[PDB]
């Protein structure tokens, strides 16, 4: 089940890095040096944020009991 | 039915990422944002609970 | 059919939440706790939503 | 196909309920539907259906504009 | 025995996809042609006009989208290496 | 399998549409926009490819970190 629900955060993560790193002007058809970097950083920060959530949340799945 | 918690888990992560991570300079979360996402989790969680309760308090009326 | 009827009112439930999340909880998250305000709003938003839902059903079913 | 007609019903339905509650309902200070909202939505529900109609009528000048030619490759034979 | 159809039938996913695309397009023409006020219930003339044009334009843009798409597929032959020099280092 | 791609596809169609097409005075895809579309199509694929990469570079970086464990003892 780690697949059907991984390929998900992927589409989510993609849709997201897109919004935050790609402006709707589409003046030029190839990635901007900067745009290229922004994506990278985003992709990473996205993954980071993704884990500590699974962690912090799991914590509160035990503690509560 | 465990495919509910996981989708909702992603639905969540995405969100918190969206509202909490603004301006990308390095590939490691800034403290300011660090807390932001942490809270975004609690807030959002409580929320789904309340809504959930207020939802149950509906079927009672008809039943 | 029953298998459906229920699952639908599960899609609704998610749409609804997505809604009231927007309408009531701002993207600031100052404190992880529900502000008295944000909590009240959230009660009505659910309420108001469910209404438009039962009413949307009738006016619609009445259309078929 | 009649359940694949009750899968699209319920679906669309939810899709609508939402679209209206979102454009219309915007005053949170009452568990009651402010009438200025009770009307917006009621038109939304109509404006919608009447729209979802006009669309279709058009997407059908896509699948029909080509059959007047395949009803032609039908003429060289029988008739 | 069995039918060799199963194979060529699935090829009909074009249908379960035109649906998906159908919705999309609908939701996009809505967001483009029908403002959220819903002043009145009937379709404003233009609204109907605008819907007419949107529904058209969307189709077109979707066809071209497809066209280009398949192009860049039968052309990954590192022929795209000749394309990466021609477009004027964009 | 193949659905995932068409699914993406259809989502691209949309996204490029709303960001590219804007003037609705005619029925023909205005030329200035028929372009945005194309760049949007390209720019996009180019984006997914990149993101994809860094994603692997994340697993093969999360794979080597298991190896470390496998050496302390």
Task: Report the total helices of chain B.
Answer: 2
Sheet-strand content of chain B, in percent, reads: under 5%
Output the CATH topology of chain B. Answer: Helix Hairpins
Class by SSE composition of chain B: mainly alpha
CATH superfamily of chain B, called what?
Mitochondrial import inner membrane translocase subunit tim13 like domains
The oligomeric state of the chains shown is: heterohexamer
**Which protein chains make the most extensive interface, counting residues with beta carbons within 8 Å of the other chain's beta carbons?**
A-B, 28 and 26 residues
* Sheet of most strands of chain A: none
Tell me the overall shape of chain A.
Answer: elongated
Tell how many strands the DSSP assignment of chain A holds.
Answer: 0
**Name of the CATH class of chain B:** Mainly Alpha
Give the percentage of residues in beta strands of chain A: under 5%
Largest sheet of chain B: none
The H/E string of chain A reads: HH
Compute the gyration radius of chain B: what is it? 16 Å
CATH topology of chain A: Helix Hairpins
* The CATH architecture of chain A: Orthogonal Bundle
